[PDB]
Amino acid sequence: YDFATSVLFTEAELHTRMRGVAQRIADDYSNCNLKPLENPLVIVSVLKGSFVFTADMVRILGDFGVPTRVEFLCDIRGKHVLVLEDILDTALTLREVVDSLKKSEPASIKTLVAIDKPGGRKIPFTAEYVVADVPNVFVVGYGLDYDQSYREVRDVVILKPSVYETW
Amino acid sequence: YDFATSVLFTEAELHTRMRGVAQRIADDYSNCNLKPLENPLVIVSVLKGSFVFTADMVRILGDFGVPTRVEFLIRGKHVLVLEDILDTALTLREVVDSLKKSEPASIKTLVAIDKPGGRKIPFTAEYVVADVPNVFVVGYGLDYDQSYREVRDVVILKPSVYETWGK
Ligand SMILES: O=c1nc[nH]c2c1ncn2CCCCCP(=O)(O)O
Ligand SMILES: O=c1nc[nH]c2c1ncn2CCCCCP(=O)(O)O
């Protein structure tokens, strides 16, 4: 890539990782009686750049028999909620959402992140399902942006410093 | 997909159709000097369910050299509105004519599924991936009451589904 220094995770790697995550989600929600219309899996997509991760993870979940219902960031009480976030760094944004969604009394609530930065936590918070982990470097791609750009990049890559230093 | 009557368009057929559309869009926006950060193609996504179509189209556009900047629901920039379904064109005509009051450089429309027969006002999108007649379809972001967006193919919903779920 013209604007990067290292491809941390390609598109094929992320898809393979999400497939294994889907197999675990299909087993952890096996006896939840998940079925379309009646009782699907309410997916609460948080953050603007998560639509890439959501559209791919939701389709992979459907391949493993996990029906989904997508909401972007109510009819949350009593139903099973799964929060999707494109990246997890400080866990401040996600902890706020989980505490907000728990105000509606869901049957179960767990989190799944595509990119996890454990070395950026301002508060302790562990996500149930994690696609991939990334060190404390600024990355773009797969929905992750640098000022509303480089979201269409198919891979998670480290943004070259000359870009955001010049910008 | 034995909850449906037919599979109108597969995931591969749509992408291979979008490949040809992305080449078409790249040729039209060639003299616009599109580049990330400085001057990308502003993608206006509508109808909530278009997140599957938007996530695939911006990545396919990136392969053909078209940098994007997604917005979900801006002056002197190029606007390309994306909708998962174009039927009566009442939603798109309102969005388009509302965007033109902000004086964009050039606003066009790209729709994944288009019902050209079944429209309430004259409207012709600049880019259409596929046609669909008077039949209710789901999949690829198209829902029946917030469900069946995870279906990777545009399929016609079984009539008894909305006959059983309507009551
Ligand atoms: O590498 C990155 N690429 C895009 N955005 C990034 C990156 N690292 C941090 N962030 C911002 C995350 C936004 C909200 C999450 P949280 O920090 O609240 O957990
Ligand atoms: O086949 C369909 N599957 C899901 N939703 C559908 C379908 N046909 C029409 N619609 C509703 C479209 C909502 C708005 C469109 P418009 O206002 O631009 O005509």
Numbering used by the authors:
A (entry chain B): 7 to 79, 102 to 195
B (entry chain A): 7 to 79, 104 to 197
Paper text:
Trypanosoma brucei is the protozoan parasite that is the causative agent of Human African Trypanosomiasis (HAT), also known as African sleeping sickness. However, in T. brucei there are no enzymes for de novo synthesis and this parasite relies solely on its salvage pathways to make its purine nucleoside monophosphates. HGPRT is central to this salvage pathway, as it is responsible for the synthesis of IMP and GMP from hypoxanthine and guanine, respectively. Thus, the crystallographic and SEC-MALLS data agree in demonstrating that TbrHGPRT is dimeric.
In the complex with 6 there are two separate dimers in the asymmetric unit, and in the complex with IMP or 5 two independent subunits are present in the asymmetric unit. The binding of 6 (with five carbons in the linker and hypoxanthine as the base) is similar to that observed for 3 (six carbons in the linker and guanine as the base) in that the purine base binds in the purine binding pocket and the phosphonate moiety binds to the amino acid residues surrounding the 5′-phosphate binding site (residues D117-T121). Compound 6, with hypoxanthine as the base cannot form a hydrogen bond between the exocyclic amino group and the main chain carbonyl of D173. Compared to 3, the purine ring of 6 is translated by ~1 Å, however four hydrogen bonds (two to K145 and two to V167) that hold the purine ring in place are conserved in the two complexes. The phosphonyl oxygen atoms in 6 form hydrogen bonds with the amide nitrogen atoms of D117, T118, A119, L120 and the side-chains of T118 and T121 similar to the binding of one of the conformations of 3. Compound 6 with one fewer carbon atom than 3, is able to reach into the 5′-phosphate binding site with its phosphonate group, thus explaining the similar Ki values for 3 and 6 (15.8 μM vs 21.2 μM). Compound 2 (with guanine as the base) and 6 (with hypoxanthine as the base) both have Ki values significantly lower than their corresponding nucleoside monophosphates, while the remaining five ANPs have Ki values similar to or greater than those for the nucleoside monophosphates. Common to 2 and 6 is the fact that they both have five carbon atoms linking the base to the phosphorus atom and this is a key factor that results in tighter binding compared to the other inhibitors. However, 2 binds more tightly to human HGPRT (0.5 μM vs 2.3 μM), while for 6 the reverse is true since it binds more tightly to TbrHGPRT (>100 μM vs 15.8 μM). For 6 the well solution was 25% PEG 3350, 0.2 M sodium iodide, 0.1 M Bis-Tris propane, pH 6.5.
